[PDB]
């Protein structure tokens, strides 16, 4: 009905984008395949690459990680790394700037 209207569909396009990334980067990593999938999932709707992260990550908190990995067509060994991609975008501790 009206539940997960902007969340569940944000995992659907991420699934096929992760497949496309794994097929073009055969010698790559699960982190590169999620990283490229998050971009194409955002590009599909015209959003930022950050808003889609909150969506696939919310979905795993609401449905559980075991449901997210099935919906995205990924392994739990790949799903656990998506949290490290979120923290790698959060690299304010690794850099210096004026404030």
């Amino acid at each position: 009905g009206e539940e997960e209207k902007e969340i569940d569909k944000l995992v659907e396009l991420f699934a096929q984008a992760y497949e496309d990334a794994r097929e073009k980067k055969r010698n790559g990593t699960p982190e590169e395949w999620v990283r490229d999938a998050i971009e194409e999932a955002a590009r599909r709707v015209g959003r930022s690459r950050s808003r889609v992260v909150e969506a696939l990550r919310r979905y795993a908190e609401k449905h559980g990680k075991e449901e997210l990995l099935k919906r995205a067509g990924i392994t739990p060994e790949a799903l656990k790394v998506i949290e490290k991609i979120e923290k790698e975008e959060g690299s304010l501790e690794h850099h210096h700037h004026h404030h």
Side-chain angles (χ1 to χ4, degrees), residues 9-22 24-25 30-57 68 72 74 78-89:
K9 70 184 296 182
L10 271 289
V11 194
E12 174 142 291
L13 34 53
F14 166 77
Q16 61 186 252
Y18 175 101
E19 198 179 86
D20 177 81
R22 186 170 67 185
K24 76 200 180 200
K25 296 167 165 287
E31 62 179 273
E32 280 188 63
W33 307 331
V34 173
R35 186 64 273 176
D36 189 82
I38 293 166
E39 192 66 70
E40 176 55 27
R43 297 197 296 224
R44 222 74 180 176
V45 331
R47 250 68 204 105
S48 181
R49 89 299 158 192
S50 63
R51 224 72 173 113
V52 46
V53 181
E54 299 178 281
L56 109 159
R57 287 270 62 136
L68 188 304
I74 68 173
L79 179 52
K80 64 100 72 171
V81 184
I82 317 188
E83 184 191 70
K84 264 57 59 174
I85 307 176
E86 187 194 85
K87 270 67 186 182
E88 284 289 283
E89 282 201 73

